[PDB]
mmCIF file of C-alpha atoms in Angstrom:
data_model
loop_
_atom_site.group_PDB
_atom_site.id
_atom_site.type_symbol
_atom_site.label_atom_id
_atom_site.label_comp_id
_atom_site.label_asym_id
_atom_site.label_seq_id
_atom_site.Cartn_x
_atom_site.Cartn_y
_atom_site.Cartn_z
ATOM 1 C CA UNK A 1 0.000 0.000 0.000
ATOM 2 C CA UNK A 2 1.043 3.694 -0.051
ATOM 3 C CA UNK A 3 0.906 3.937 3.796
ATOM 4 C CA UNK A 4 4.162 1.946 4.234
ATOM 5 C CA UNK A 5 5.765 4.338 1.681
ATOM 6 C CA UNK A 6 4.424 7.529 3.337
ATOM 7 C CA UNK A 7 5.616 6.056 6.682
ATOM 8 C CA UNK A 8 9.408 6.087 5.993
ATOM 9 C CA UNK A 9 9.151 9.677 4.640
ATOM 10 C CA UNK A 10 6.814 10.716 7.518
ATOM 11 C CA UNK A 11 9.404 9.704 10.198
ATOM 12 C CA UNK A 12 12.423 11.025 8.231
ATOM 13 C CA UNK A 13 10.752 14.498 8.081
ATOM 14 C CA UNK A 14 10.976 14.757 11.914
ATOM 15 C CA UNK A 15 14.440 14.788 13.570
ATOM 16 C CA UNK A 16 15.492 12.466 16.449
ATOM 17 C CA UNK A 17 14.669 15.231 18.990
ATOM 18 C CA UNK A 18 11.166 15.705 17.477
ATOM 19 C CA UNK A 19 10.492 11.924 17.209
ATOM 20 C CA UNK A 20 11.379 11.426 20.915
ATOM 21 C CA UNK A 21 9.441 14.635 21.776
ATOM 22 C CA UNK A 22 6.295 13.261 20.051
ATOM 23 C CA UNK A 23 6.809 9.794 21.665
ATOM 24 C CA UNK A 24 5.714 10.905 25.176
ATOM 25 C CA UNK A 25 2.858 13.049 23.737
ATOM 26 C CA UNK A 26 1.565 10.140 21.582
ATOM 27 C CA UNK A 27 1.812 7.607 24.465
ATOM 28 C CA UNK A 28 -0.497 9.906 26.543
ATOM 29 C CA UNK A 29 -3.391 7.721 25.260
ATOM 30 C CA UNK A 30 -1.610 4.323 24.991
ATOM 31 C CA UNK A 31 -4.253 2.265 26.869
ATOM 32 C CA UNK A 32 -2.280 -0.954 26.161
ATOM 33 C CA UNK A 33 1.212 0.608 25.819
ATOM 34 C CA UNK A 34 2.114 -0.946 22.427
ATOM 35 C CA UNK A 35 3.253 2.278 20.669
ATOM 36 C CA UNK A 36 -0.350 2.984 19.511
ATOM 37 C CA UNK A 37 -3.486 4.805 20.753
ATOM 38 C CA UNK A 38 -7.170 4.709 19.689
ATOM 39 C CA UNK A 39 -7.656 5.968 16.095
ATOM 40 C CA UNK A 40 -10.345 8.321 17.527
ATOM 41 C CA UNK A 41 -7.746 9.789 19.949
ATOM 42 C CA UNK A 42 -5.450 10.480 16.914
ATOM 43 C CA UNK A 43 -6.954 14.019 16.837
ATOM 44 C CA UNK A 44 -5.997 14.600 20.520
ATOM 45 C CA UNK A 45 -2.314 13.558 20.094
ATOM 46 C CA UNK A 46 -2.018 15.902 17.050
ATOM 47 C CA UNK A 47 -3.555 18.830 19.011
ATOM 48 C CA UNK A 48 -1.629 18.007 22.240
ATOM 49 C CA UNK A 49 1.637 18.353 20.236
ATOM 50 C CA UNK A 50 0.690 21.689 18.581
ATOM 51 C CA UNK A 51 -1.016 20.736 15.251
ATOM 52 C CA UNK A 52 -4.752 21.130 14.487
ATOM 53 C CA UNK A 53 -6.373 18.430 12.324
ATOM 54 C CA UNK A 54 -9.830 19.569 11.089
ATOM 55 C CA UNK A 55 -12.764 17.279 12.049
ATOM 56 C CA UNK A 56 -13.238 16.381 8.341
ATOM 57 C CA UNK A 57 -9.555 15.298 8.209
ATOM 58 C CA UNK A 58 -9.833 13.339 11.509
ATOM 59 C CA UNK A 59 -12.730 11.144 10.246
ATOM 60 C CA UNK A 60 -11.032 10.751 6.819
ATOM 61 C CA UNK A 61 -7.642 9.880 8.414
ATOM 62 C CA UNK A 62 -9.145 7.593 11.118
ATOM 63 C CA UNK A 63 -11.017 5.443 8.543
ATOM 64 C CA UNK A 64 -7.707 5.237 6.590
ATOM 65 C CA UNK A 65 -5.813 3.950 9.688
ATOM 66 C CA UNK A 66 -8.884 1.975 10.943
ATOM 67 C CA UNK A 67 -8.567 -0.416 7.935
ATOM 68 C CA UNK A 68 -5.806 -2.278 9.888
ATOM 69 C CA UNK A 69 -8.426 -4.264 11.889
ATOM 70 C CA UNK A 70 -7.457 -3.294 15.483
ATOM 71 C CA UNK A 71 -8.751 0.323 15.299
ATOM 72 C CA UNK A 72 -5.485 1.888 16.604
ATOM 73 C CA UNK A 73 -2.625 3.901 15.023
ATOM 74 C CA UNK A 74 1.003 2.638 15.084
ATOM 75 C CA UNK A 75 3.753 5.194 15.894
ATOM 76 C CA UNK A 76 5.603 4.552 12.582
ATOM 77 C CA UNK A 77 2.332 4.924 10.580
ATOM 78 C CA UNK A 78 0.975 7.726 12.828
ATOM 79 C CA UNK A 79 4.150 9.735 12.003
ATOM 80 C CA UNK A 80 2.541 10.419 8.568
ATOM 81 C CA UNK A 81 -0.420 12.072 10.380
ATOM 82 C CA UNK A 82 2.065 14.143 12.463
ATOM 83 C CA UNK A 83 4.145 15.485 9.525
ATOM 84 C CA UNK A 84 1.301 15.790 6.969
ATOM 85 C CA UNK A 85 -0.610 17.904 9.551
ATOM 86 C CA UNK A 86 2.541 19.795 10.714
ATOM 87 C CA UNK A 87 3.514 20.525 7.066
ATOM 88 C CA UNK A 88 0.880 23.306 7.322
ATOM 89 C CA UNK A 89 1.122 23.937 11.118
ATOM 90 C CA UNK A 90 4.931 24.382 10.858
#
């Protein structure tokens, strides 16, 4: 799929200091603690860091990451939501 391709570029866009900085903010909703939070909480982690995903983008991005089957977002795949939203917030 194109998600695995947008993943490598999504993490590379953020530096080591930003990746570790977003790690604690993203794990704020890690109910299980497996490097992933609820796809619905994906809007909170983006806002808690400083970005602002519109509600239309949250539902469109959640359904895209909800196709995995578990209903959660992985840190490596979620990094695309962080950079793609920060590309405008930055």
